[PDB]
Amino acid sequence: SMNPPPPETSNPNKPKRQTNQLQYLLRVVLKTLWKHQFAWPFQQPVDAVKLNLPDYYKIIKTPMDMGTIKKRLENNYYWNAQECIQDFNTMFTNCYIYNKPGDDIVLMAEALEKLFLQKINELPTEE
Numbered sequence: 001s002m003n004p005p006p007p008e009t010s011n012p013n014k015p016k017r018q019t020n021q022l023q024y025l026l027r028v029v030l031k032t033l034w035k036h037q038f039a040w041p042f043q044q045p046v047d048a049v050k051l052n053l054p055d056y057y058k059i060i061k062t063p064m065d066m067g068t069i070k071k072r073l074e075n076n077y078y079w080n081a082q083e084c085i086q087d088f089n090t091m092f093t094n095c096y097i098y099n100k101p102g103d104d105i106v107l108m109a110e111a112l113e114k115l116f117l118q119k120i121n122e123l124p125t126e127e
């Protein structure tokens with residue numbers, strides 16, 4: 001109860017589609033970032049209990065993580081690529097809001113975002 005419920009990874013009343021762009025976001029973007037040596041702190045929701053970050057969910061009100069994103073991609077949750085991109089950007093942004101430059105966790109996010117940006121540069125033209 002110090003942690004909130006995690007973000008949903010399915011929602012039967014949400015509209016969704018499959019696109020070449022969403023497939024690329026799973027195949028290339030998520031899987032590449034997932035395997036990165038700095039991936040591990042972002043592979044699941046921030047556990048404020050285990051990590052003794054009792055202020056986290058007082059500061060971060062739209063939590064996101066790659067475990068959630070991966071599940072959303074696997075579960076065909078998204079209407080378009082933009083929705084998924086927004087979730088990665090929320091993940092990064094949260095990290096940069098809560099922490100400060102030079103913190104380890106920030107170096108990790110930055111390195112992951114740098115790669116994310118590289119991969120999003122080659123996002124295929126839709127259809």
Ligand SMILES: CN1Cc2cc(Br)ccc2NC1=O
Pocket residue numbers: 041042046051094095098099105
């Ligand atoms: C995204 N994270 C996860 C994390 C893992 C460890 Br270990 C220590 C601090 C944090 N804080 C974050 O912002």
